[PDB]
């Protein structure tokens, strides 16, 4: 129920199990990654689609068992001055495989001269700060992006959906369902005595 609020979603249509059917199926483990990207790079992350910001950063493959949910929110995400905390990799060594990461504070070369402490014209930095400012356009705005991944058929399932509960009933036989025990019969007060593990 906390997945249908907290600002309108920029992209809630899913590419796998439906987001309305999370209650209907119980999962083993759920994986979430939290980062903010520019508004022009939201279209880059997609099943079977990549560009410059998508290939050199985390990539979402065609098969994911999950999808992406993003929303627009500017409360502590955009700065009127500078925003150097949020950086993107735009000059990488090679393609970045999915479910992998790499961090480097050292300059990235682009030719034959090995730059490992000296810079110049042919050597640049692989990192660059985001242009997150409210004075810019809509596509330059920061967007809170989270991706949900589900792991199935590898472990016992414990992340189950919220199964609702109803009110009491007495002396009138219904089609009850007590923790998976489905049956039909009256509900009367029991004179028996159980044990706490029973």
């Amino acid at each position, epitope marked *: 129920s906390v997945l249908y609020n907290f600002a309108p979603f920029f992209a809630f249509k899913c590419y796998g199990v439906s987001p309305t059917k999370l209650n209907d199926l119980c999962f083993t483990n759920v994986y979430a990654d939290s980062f903010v990207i520019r508004g022009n790079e939201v279209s880059q992350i997609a099943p079977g689609q990549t560009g410059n910001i998508a290939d050199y950063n985390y990539k979402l493959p065609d098969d994911f068992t999950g999808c992406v949910i993003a929303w627009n929110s500017n409360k*502590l995400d955009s*700065k*009127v*001055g*500078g*925003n*150097y*905390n949020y*950086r993107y990799r735009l000059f990488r060594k090679s393609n970045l495989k999915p479910f992998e990461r790499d961090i480097s*504070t*050292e*300059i990235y070369q682009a030719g034959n001269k090995p*730059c490992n*402490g*000296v*810079a*110049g014209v042919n*050597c640049y*930095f692989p*990192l660059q*700060s985001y242009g997150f400012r409210p004075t810019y356009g809509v596509g330059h705005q920061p967007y809170r992006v989270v991706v949900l991944s589900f792991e199935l058929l590898h472990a016992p399932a414990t992340v189950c959906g919220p199964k609702k509960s109803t009110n009491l009933v007495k002396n009138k036989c219904v089609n009850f369902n007590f923790n998976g025990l489905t049956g039909t019969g009256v509900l009367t007060e029991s004179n028996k005595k159980f044990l706490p593990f029973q």
Partner: antibody
Amino acid sequence: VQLVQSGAEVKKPGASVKVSCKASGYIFSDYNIHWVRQAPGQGLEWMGWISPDSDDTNYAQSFQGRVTMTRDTSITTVYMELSSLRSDDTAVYFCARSVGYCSLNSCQRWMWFDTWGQGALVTVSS
Amino acid sequence: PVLTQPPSASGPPGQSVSISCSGSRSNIGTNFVYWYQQLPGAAPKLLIYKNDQRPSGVPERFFGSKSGTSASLAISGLRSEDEVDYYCAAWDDSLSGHVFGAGTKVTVL
């Protein structure tokens, strides 16, 4: 912006002083405040930034307990405490204003001191 | 990894001259190098940021560039009103703090 400095007296070693720079004239949740000390006979020294919305700081390998950096969002005024003043600590504490949040370590490469305002003169003697 | 700057500068007016600001290995080049100045008895300002473009409000006389460990400040013509105290600013990842040069004093010959 109102980057004025509050006056401080000369105190002998064995106590601590308070150096305050006014942070009004701009929003306190988006602009960073940096402090640089200029001492004659050597280069400038730089000890840490502040994040004026929460608790976040980074120290260099020059001072660990002499410099305490605080913040106040209700009054929009930062207060700095310097203890055990000496010839090494005798420097012009400059109040610098820079844009950017920079609560991490890889963001300070892209920062630069936009405006320097009303560097306080601090001295010390018995 | 301390920045190396001469204590005094010998700049003759009428011709160009280059001055150097060098650090050490993994000190200059991995991070951008800035040029800063301060008026005597006044708050400092910035001369050249990132050694790429000249900021607005400053005349285009000082040329900023980096050549490996050595950072060069190229000038074209010397004026009597441009005798501000020059300084070198850089960032190093081995200290997590800004390292500044010794400071170069420009005196007219």
